[PDB]
Amino acid sequence: AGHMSLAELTLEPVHRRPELLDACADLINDQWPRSRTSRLHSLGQSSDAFPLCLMLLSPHPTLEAAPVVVGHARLSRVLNQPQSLLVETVVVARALRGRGFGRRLMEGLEVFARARGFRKLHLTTHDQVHFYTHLGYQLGEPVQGLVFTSRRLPATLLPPPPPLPECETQYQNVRGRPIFWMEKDI
Amino acid sequence: DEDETTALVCDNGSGLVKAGFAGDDAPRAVFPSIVGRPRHQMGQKDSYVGDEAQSKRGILTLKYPIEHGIITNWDDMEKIWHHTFYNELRVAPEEHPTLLTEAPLNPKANREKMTQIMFETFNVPAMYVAIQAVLSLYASGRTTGIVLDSGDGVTHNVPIYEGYALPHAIMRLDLAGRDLTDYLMKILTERGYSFVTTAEREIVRDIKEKLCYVALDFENEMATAASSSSLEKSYELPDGQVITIGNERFRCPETLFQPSFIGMESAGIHETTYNSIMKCDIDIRKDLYANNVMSGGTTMYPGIADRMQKEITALAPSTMKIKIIAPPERKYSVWIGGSILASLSTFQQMWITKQEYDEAGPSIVHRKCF
Amino acid sequence: GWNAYIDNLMADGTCQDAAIVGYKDSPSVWAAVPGKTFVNITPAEVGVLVGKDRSSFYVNGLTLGGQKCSVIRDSLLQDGEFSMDLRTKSTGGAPTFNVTVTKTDKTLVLLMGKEGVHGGLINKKCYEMASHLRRSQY
Numbered sequence: 214a215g216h217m218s219l220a221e222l223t224l225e226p227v228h229r230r231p232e233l234l235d236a237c238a239d240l241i242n243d244q245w246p247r248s249r250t251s252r253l254h255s256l257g258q259s260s261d262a263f264p265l266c267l268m269l270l271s272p273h274p275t276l277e278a279a280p281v282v283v284g285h286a287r288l289s290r291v292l293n294q295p296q297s298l299l300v301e302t303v304v305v306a307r308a309l310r311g312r313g314f315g316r317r318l319m320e321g322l323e324v325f326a327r328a329r330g331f332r333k334l335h336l337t338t339h340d341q342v343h344f345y346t347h348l349g350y351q352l353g354e355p356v357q358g359l360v361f362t363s364r365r366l367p368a369t370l371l372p373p374p375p376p377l378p379e380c381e382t383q384y385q386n387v388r389g390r391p392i393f394w395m396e397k398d399i
Numbered sequence: 400d401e402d403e404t405t406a407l408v409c410d411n412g413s414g415l416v417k418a419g420f421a422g423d424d425a426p427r428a429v430f431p432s433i434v435g436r437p438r439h440q441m442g443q444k445d446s447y448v449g450d451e452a453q454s455k456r457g458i459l460t461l462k463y464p465i466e467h468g469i470i471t472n473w474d475d476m477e478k479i480w481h482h483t484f485y486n487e488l489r490v491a492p493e494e495h496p497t498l499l500t501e502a503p504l505n506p507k508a509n510r511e512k513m514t515q516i517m518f519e520t521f522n523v524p525a526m527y528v529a530i531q532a533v534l535s536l537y538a539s540g541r542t543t544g545i546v547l548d549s550g551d552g553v554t555h556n557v558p559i560y561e562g563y564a565l566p567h568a569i570m571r572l573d574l575a576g577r578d579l580t581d582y583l584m585k586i587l588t589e590r591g592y593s594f595v596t597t598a599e600r601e602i603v604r605d606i607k608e609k610l611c612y613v614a615l616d617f618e619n620e621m622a623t624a625a626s627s628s629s630l631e632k633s634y635e636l637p638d639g640q641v642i643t644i645g646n647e648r649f650r651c652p653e654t655l656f657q658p659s660f661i662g663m664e665s666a667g668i669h670e671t672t673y674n675s676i677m678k679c680d681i682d683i684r685k686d687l688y689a690n691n692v693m694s695g696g697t698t699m700y701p702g703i704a705d706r707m708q709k710e711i712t713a714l715a716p717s718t719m720k721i722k723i724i725a726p727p728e729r730k731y732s733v734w735i736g737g738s739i740l741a742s743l744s745t746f747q748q749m750w751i752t753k754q755e756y757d758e759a760g761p762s763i764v765h766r767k768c769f
Numbered sequence: 770g771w772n773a774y775i776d777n778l779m780a781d782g783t784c785q786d787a788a789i790v791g792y793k794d795s796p797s798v799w800a801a802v803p804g805k806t807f808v809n810i811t812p813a814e815v816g817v818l819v820g821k822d823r824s825s826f827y828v829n830g831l832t833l834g835g836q837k838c839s840v841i842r843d844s845l846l847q848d849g850e851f852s853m854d855l856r857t858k859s860t861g862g863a864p865t866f867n868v869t870v871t872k873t874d875k876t877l878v879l880l881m882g883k884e885g886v887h888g889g890l891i892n893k894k895c896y897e898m899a900s901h902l903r904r905s906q907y
């Protein structure tokens with residue numbers, strides 16, 4: 214409690230609002246710095262085929278007509294699990310945190326995914342584990358996300374033994390940090 | 400948590416670099432594999448790379464760090480890779496798994512040094528080295544077949560089984576697009592023109608690309624050219640002067656089938672294709688004959704597929720099914736194949752990670768990449 | 770026993786078959802996955818693997834427990850490498866699999882990957898087990 218949300222918000226894919234892609238890149242790179250080239254390219258991959266990048270938007274700063282990119286999440290399909298989606302890059306603009314927008318992002322993701330027949334969401338975290346358990350996630354097993362591939366690509370594609378050496382890479386992130394795999398039925 | 404960065408795909412050729420992002424259908428950057436240095440007469444830089452060397456080529460001597468598909472100047476190759484990451488793609492290499500391509504039969508010590516430089520100089524988090532011809536096969540939608548890869552500096556026949564090149568059967572021919580350009584310069588000069596400078600060579604390369612073709616029956620085409628002017632074409636130089644070209648249009652790429660035209664005592668590409676197949680497992684030859692894939696810029700000549708079909712037919716058993724596949728994007732089929740390979744779910748296991756490199760050293764490339 | 774080595778090679782689920790085979794004097798399977806292919810390797814197949822003729826099996830292939838294979842790379846008798854990479858052959862569209870053979874002082878170490886498992890992963894796995902056995906005089 215104490216995070217009631219009052220703003221009007223929509224949830225829309227980046228590839229349908231390309232004019233907001235630069236602002237979305239600003240949002241994500243403020244949290245996770247990497248080259249702007251790479252972040253812009255990552256968002257430019259978004260499509261209806263997945264992966265796709267959803268933005269939480271607010272019509273105005275209640276001043277003029279430029280919409281605010283409040284938050285972002287990336288959704289990807291999952292190898293060998295048709296009803297699963299992998300959720301990544303969940304972020305609310307730093308200056309807008311603590312206002313309920315993170316809850317509304319995650320709940321909007323569920324609505325979006327469920328409407329398209331998906332029944333399970335997966336993600337990794339370490340520091341934010343209690344954010345996700347608070348929203349109904351629990352510990353799960355690892356999954357492999359399916360990355361972007363352009364539409365145009367083919368798509369066709371007896372002596373005794375000596376002692377043995379010393380007698381879960383899925384559960385670590387890029388830097389050898391153990392991470393929690395979380396999941397939620399939707 | 401943050402999504403993982405998309406892999407980079409870098410295809411290093413004797414003449415052109417093609418670079419981009421895995422999953423894209425075309426490279427983001429295509430630029431010349433050159434390092435330039437002042438001819439005679441600070442200056443601004445002790446050397447110039449890629450598109451900057453191209454812009455300033457008038458005052459520079461140009462060197463190609465890759466010869467016949469093989470890296471031979473490692474200091475200048477490092478400049479090319481640096482230029483690729485920071486100037487052409489404008490990415491940070493330490494942020495991306497990087498797929499590199501290599502020539503068929505790339506020497507053992509070369510692929511180790513490639514691995515060492517990528518991990519220690521550019522600090523990539525992971526890398527992989529794939530044979531160029533194999534990637535072109537993937538781009539054609541197949542995993543078994545025999546590829547004819549002819550670029551600017553080298554031509555290879557590469558038979559491939561289930562995605563694995565068969566090195567014992569690979570054929571190499573040190574004749575490719577730059578030699579054909581040099582030959583056209585020579586025989587155009589024998590026609591009355593004078594193309595002899597490095598700048599004039601670039602013009603003749605454009606003539607070659609725009610007007611040359613492979614004759615289905617070479618001697619008949621020569622007779623046609625001698626008895627009328629129906630095969631002659633004009634070409635407008637940058638200064639407005641016009642030249643005309645006749646049987647040179649098809650004599651130039653006929654060299655691919657008759658290397659004696661440039662003084663080489665070597666079998667033509669049709670014979671090397673046959674010889675390559677005959678060194679392969681008997682059980683896969685039918686599939687090789689049925690899946691001849693053309694790749695590289697020097698296979699772009701009109702008529703080359705029909706000519707290969709005819710010549711391979713004459714060499715093969717009379718009952719053998721022969722098919723030549725010439726994809727339209729085959730100037731870039733190596734890069735496209737790398738984009739596919741680095742995008743496959745099955746490719747996650749294949750990367751060499753920085754940790755694997757720290758454990759095993761550069762020779763890990765020999766275990767994991769073939 | 771040697772079957773501990775087989776369990777060790779099979780533990781990570783990447784391989785469908787594995788075996789340790791003695792190739793000196795009279796060859797024999799020291800340990801193998803029961804019910805699979807390598808367990809049935811014959812002395813004549815071992816002799817082809819380690820024999821003097823390193824050329825005929827390119828055009829004729831070779832067999833392992835009667836399973837026909839195609840040779841991709843052969844370094845089995847070469848210093849510092851001592852490995853051979855193969856891919857099985859099938860009929861009627863059935864899947865094929867990558868195999869690596871490594872040669873120690875007294876054994877051959879064989880591994881066959883499951884479907885889709887890259888030959889490089891299998892080679893690395895086989896090379897490391899062979900390095901371990903060489904370390905201990907085997």
Ligand SMILES: CC(C)(COP(=O)(O)OP(=O)(O)OC[C@H]1O[C@@H](n2cnc3c(N)ncnc32)[C@H](O)[C@@H]1OP(=O)(O)O)[C@@H](O)C(=O)NCCC(=O)NCCS
Pocket residue numbers: 214215216217244302303304305306309310311312313314315316317337338339340341343344345347400401
């Ligand atoms: C994680 C993040 C999206 C949450 O959004 P937020 O605006 O800060 O949180 P909200 O205001 O929407 O809070 C929603 C609910 O979750 C709780 N919550 C928010 N952050 C929490 C946290 N770190 N731990 C536990 N609970 C948290 C809130 O108390 C609130 O509870 P309530 O709705 O029952 O009252 C946001 O903080 C962020 O972008 N952080 C940096 C990026 C990051 O770490 N991303 C990946 C996580 S693996």
Ligand SMILES: Nc1ncnc2c1ncn2[C@@H]1O[C@H](COP(=O)(O)OP(=O)(O)OP(=O)(O)O)[C@@H](O)[C@H]1O
Pocket residue numbers: 411412413414415416467468469549550551552553554575576577604607608609694695696697698699700730
């Ligand atoms: N339409 C065309 N017709 C004929 N030749 C062409 C055509 N387009 C490009 N070429 C030639 O292809 C060559 C470049 O092709 P490519 O990029 O495959 O070679 P590369 O990778 O740079 O060199 P290599 O593979 O030999 O190391 C040049 O010689 C170019 O002149």
Ligand SMILES: C/C1=C/C(=O)O[C@@H]2C[C@@H](CC[C@H](C)/C=C\CC1)O[C@@](O)([C@@H]1CSC(=O)N1)C2
Pocket residue numbers: 413414415430431432433453456461551576577578580581600601604
């Ligand atoms: C358009 C283009 C084509 C090409 O093939 O580029 C590559 C690389 C190039 C490097 C020097 C050149 C002046 C720079 C850019 C040319 C790039 O050399 C080539 O033109 C060579 C030189 S003569 C020839 O036929 N190919 C091939």
Ligand SMILES: [Ca+2]
Pocket residue numbers: 411412413531550695733
């Ligand atoms: Ca090339």
